[PDB]
Design a protein around this nucleic acid. Structure first.
Lengths: 97, 77, 135, 365, 112
RNA sequence: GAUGGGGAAGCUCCGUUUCAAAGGCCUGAUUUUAUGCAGGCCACCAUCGAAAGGGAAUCCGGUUAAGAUUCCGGAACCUGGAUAUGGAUUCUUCACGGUAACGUAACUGAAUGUGGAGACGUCGGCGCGAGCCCUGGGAGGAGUUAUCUUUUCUUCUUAAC
RNA sequence: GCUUGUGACGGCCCGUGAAAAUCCACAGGAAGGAAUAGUUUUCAUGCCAGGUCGUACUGAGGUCUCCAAG
């Protein structure tokens, strides 16, 4: 499960949350894998997809809303986009997800 | 009716030659809470609207009435 | 990868120059004592060079190719970074932090910038940057 | 318009009958490695203080040009984030308190130049009072700093009262509390107004009657403090306003402008400028009155100071005459930057300049 | 405790016929007819009261300067700055989707 | 409810955009067999129908035997039109600050496309404002009083803009 | 407290809530703009003008309506 794969990284490795910080990370090239929620705005979705195309970053669409991405990271609030700066003890990069 | 808190502005208005009369209004007022004083009010019927001049000082009033053009009709109160 | 670079084209989203295209001359990834946020130093062009046909001659041609530039410190949050790129080496030492906040150093910044953009528009290259962003 | 060009120049008195006024330079102050951004002269008339982006406040003489004093504020000087912006001597007779604004804090230095009577008068005025006001640490005790007033944002300007008890400080990008009135006698930091109209560039006190002239980017706003309200509002013909200066009799006013204007406001005549004059080549960086003689200067960013004679007629309802005198040149332009500041000598017609050439100059009659 | 009459000829309680009971310098109450209130100009794209535009009667906009009817951006006096932002983003990326589609189209033609 | 059409022996009825040629604007060195006018743009439909619907802008004091938001004194505002001056439009050619929401004495903008106001159901509680009501002190007047009562009544106002 | 005005909410509907005159705004980028007053006046100040008709009073099983002290 993806929830097991993510919650490990959030308790072990370096990460970020939200739009502005992910874009800052893509500019720095320090992002390795970005996670995009389903219910995110189309303009912000296209802007992240294009920025990742520039930085050459692997892109993963999270199946389900931002609430389920907040649940996945284990936080009460909602998150539109999550990045992976540092991959944890899991092999999340080389996997399909 | 419009406030001008500006001395030479009033004197510019008096010499317009489209002005027939002026008026100097004298009042009895008090400051803060302590003492009574005397307030003057220099009013000209301007081109469109009436312009007024509150001067809380009495010496500046004493100078200004003296400084008016002598051909202009001046009205007390 | 830190894409927001010294030769990077961007589209300004906010404030008087909204819709106007820019180039980040010098990024500031973690702000300064003035501007405590991830911003960028840009030099874009306000009055776009207008179209010129074979009917226009000698004076109208001089009028159309004339470009009016602008310099502004702008936040990343009001920038739309573009895939495109532009040569910047002519005016890297011209615009800095000292260039901003103290004119008329902004004036002689604007003159070098005006020159660079007009000299680049003439001898037709980088045509996408000088076309009007239609919105 | 079949006419001569000669009947377009206004009938103005020839500058020779309006002496004295400074013509040539006498004292060249060569000691800095950075551009002299600011100046200040003592009320007595010897100790000329300078400030630069080599992080070094130097105090000079007026007749010789010898460096009588040196204090260095920042240690990592070429770190461009904060520099010495504005310095001000205390206008009070014989106490010798020097303010220095470097970045986010104001350092009140009383120097070891003077002695004991004048010095300890200044010192006891500082330590009497016992944004926050700090006790100076060991490193701060070395740099002759009596007190440091630290703030959240960068201070760019400073101006005292006529007394020397209050001093106003202006911080751009501070929002609401962009104008602050401090007092030394009680260590009280007052923010006199609950809002600020946009971005503020300058603020200077009226000479004698209690009102502050907060000078925004676009406006000059006359604020009374005995009523704590707005009184008058100046509309300069220009757009962007560098520096203000008030006539010593408190009747008239000058505004300098980044968009090349210098505007003579009469505070009796109108809200508009009485005379707009737009002659400078670059941004008019500093405009200052002489205190005694009817003179004012105008130092722009082109390395050129223009000196003007300005008669003011008090009792009679007669508009003030302003005539030009001399174009002072010779200043070196360092990367599109001329004369950063100019200050008159208190009692005679001499003028202290400060260029980007890392060199202050004194001009003489 | 003065009772107050309508001043204009309409005796009815319409939208146009609102009343403010005002004390006059003659020491008596009298009615004042309330001018129908001005509304905020609104975002054509958003549907929100756009900032920095004067709120006046429709006819009253003719008298006032252009700096009270427009903010300085593109689509200034008609949009939001958020709805302008959104269409700068949108028009950019749509314009770049056109490029990518031309790249794919030119590649497929070379394949055939 | 005319017009176009169609009925009706007819007085006149049907019909309201209909298979009507329904008209009002721009471009031009004067239009190349020599001074005869060419090309383009737009596509619904007259009009009447509200003194309670939508609507530019006026108040106060005064004045008559009887007129008042109309008259007088004072003080205003709206609309349309010529134009005059100062200011701006910056080293000459349509201004700039703020990270940003936005700010400004201005800061040209044709065809054409669009948006807002106009411009909108009804109730409930809650917040805030104005008028009325109740009241304390004080500055005046009228009253009652053998008794008690710092008593009862009245004046103490502030319009558009 | 009564009268009235206004603000933010919450219900009641698949009941989604007259039209037009008039006024403003945006997108657009046509055209124009200098060396004895360049172009532009949504900035400030200044000039002139505003026709016809109604207008008195009453309006109380028996037409409509407003103001409302203790």
């Amino acid at each position: 499960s993806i929830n097991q794969k993510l919650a490990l990284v959030i308790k072990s490795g370096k990460y970020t949350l939200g739009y502005k910080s992910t874009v800052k990370s893509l500019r720095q090239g320090k992002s390795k894998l970005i996670i995009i929620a389903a219910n995110t705005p189309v303009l912000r979705k296209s802007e992240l997809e294009y920025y990742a195309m520039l930085s050459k970053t692997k892109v993963y669409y999270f199946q389900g809303g931002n609430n389920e991405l907040g649940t996945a990271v284990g936080k009460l609030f909602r998150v539109g986009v999550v990045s992976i700066l540092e991959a944890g003890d899991s092999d999340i990069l080389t996997t399909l997800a | 009716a419009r406030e001008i808190t500006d001395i030479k502005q009033f004197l510019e208005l008096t010499r317009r030659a489209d002005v027939k009369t002026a008026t100097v209004k004298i009042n009895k007022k008090l400051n803060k809470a302590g003492k009574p004083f005397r307030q003057t009010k220099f009013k000209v019927r301007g081109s469109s609207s009436l312009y007024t001049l509150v001067i809380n000082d009495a010496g500046k009033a004493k100078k200004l009435i003296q400084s008016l053009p002598p051909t202009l009709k001046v009205n007390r109160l | 990868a830190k894409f927001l670079k010294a030769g990077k084209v961007a589209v300004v989203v906010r404030g008087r120059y909204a819709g106007k295209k820019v180039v980040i001359v010098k990024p500031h990834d973690e702000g300064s004592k003035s501007h405590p946020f991830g911003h960028a130093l840009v030099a874009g062009i306000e009055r776009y060079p207008l179209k010129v046909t074979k009917k226009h001659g000698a004076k109208k041609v001089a009028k159309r190719t004339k470009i009016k530039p602008f310099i502004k410190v702008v936040n990343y949050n009001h920038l739309l970074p573009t895939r495109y790129t532009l040569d910047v080496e002519a005016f890297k030492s011209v615009v800095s932090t000292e260039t901003f906040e103290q004119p008329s150093q902004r004036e002689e910044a604007k003159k070098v910038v005006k020159k660079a953009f007009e000299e680049r528009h003439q001898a037709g290259k980088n045509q996408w940057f000088f076309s009007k962003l239609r919105f | 318009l079949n006419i001569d060009p000669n009947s377009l120049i206004p009938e103005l008195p020839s500058p020779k009958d309006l002496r004295p006024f400074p013509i040539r330079c006498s004292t060249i102050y060569a000691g800095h490695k950075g551009k002299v951004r600011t100046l200040s002269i003592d009320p007595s008339g010897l100790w000329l203080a300078t400030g630069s982006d080599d992080g070094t406040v130097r105090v000079w003489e007026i007749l010789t040009g010898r460096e009588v004093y040196r204090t260095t504020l920042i240690d990592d000087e070429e770190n461009p984030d904060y520099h010495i912006e504005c310095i001000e001597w205390n206008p009070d007779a014989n106490n010798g308190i020097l303010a220095v604004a470097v970045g986010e804090n104001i350092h009140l230095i009383v120097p070891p130049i003077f002695g004991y009577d004048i010095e300890n008068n200044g010192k006891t005025k500082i330590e009497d009072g016992f944004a926050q006001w700090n006790k100076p640490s060991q490193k701060q005790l070395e740099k002759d700093i009596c007190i440091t007033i630290s703030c959240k944002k960068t201070v760019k300007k400073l101006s005292w009262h006529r007394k020397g008890d209050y001093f106003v400080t202006v911080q751009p990008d501070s929002g609401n509390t962009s104008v602050l009135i401090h007092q030394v006698s009680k260590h009280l930091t007052q923010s006199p107004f609950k809002k600020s109209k946009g971005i503020i560039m300058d603020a200077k006190f009226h000479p004698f009657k209690p009102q502050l002239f907060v000078c925004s980017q676009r406006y000059v706003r006359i604020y009374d403090l005995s009523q704590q309200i707005l009184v008058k509002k100046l509309l300069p013909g220009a757009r962007w306003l560098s520096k203000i200066d008030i006539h010593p009799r408190g009747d008239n006013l000058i505004a300098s402008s980044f968009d090349k204007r210098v505007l003579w406001h009469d505070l009796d005549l109108a809200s508009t400028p009485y005379k707009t004059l737009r002659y400078h080549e670059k941004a008019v960086r500093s405009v200052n009155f002489h205190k005694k003689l009817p003179l004012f200067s105008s130092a722009a960013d082109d390395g050129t100071i223009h000196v003007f004679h300005a008669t003011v007629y008090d009792d009679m309802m007669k508009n003030p005459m302003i005539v030009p005198l001399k174009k002072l040149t010779g200043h070196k332009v360092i990367n599109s930057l001329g004369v950063l500041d100019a200050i008159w000598h208190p009692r005679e017609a001499w003028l202290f300049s400060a260029g980007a050439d890392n060199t202050a100059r004194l001009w003489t009659t | 405790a003065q009772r107050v009459t309508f001043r204009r000829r309409n005796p009815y309680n319409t939208r146009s016929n609102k009343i403010k009971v005002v004390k006059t310098p003659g020491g008596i109450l009298r009615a004042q007819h309330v001018k129908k209130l001005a509304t905020r100009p609104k975002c054509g794209d958003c549907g929100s009261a756009l900032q920095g535009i004067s709120t006046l009667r429709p006819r009253q906009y003719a008298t006032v300067s252009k700096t009270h009817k427009t903010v300085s951006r593109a689509y200034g006096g008609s949009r939001c700055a958020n709805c302008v932002k959104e269409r700068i983003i949108r028009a950019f990326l749509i314009e770049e989707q056109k490029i990518v589609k031309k790249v794919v189209k030119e590649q497929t033609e070379a394949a055939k």
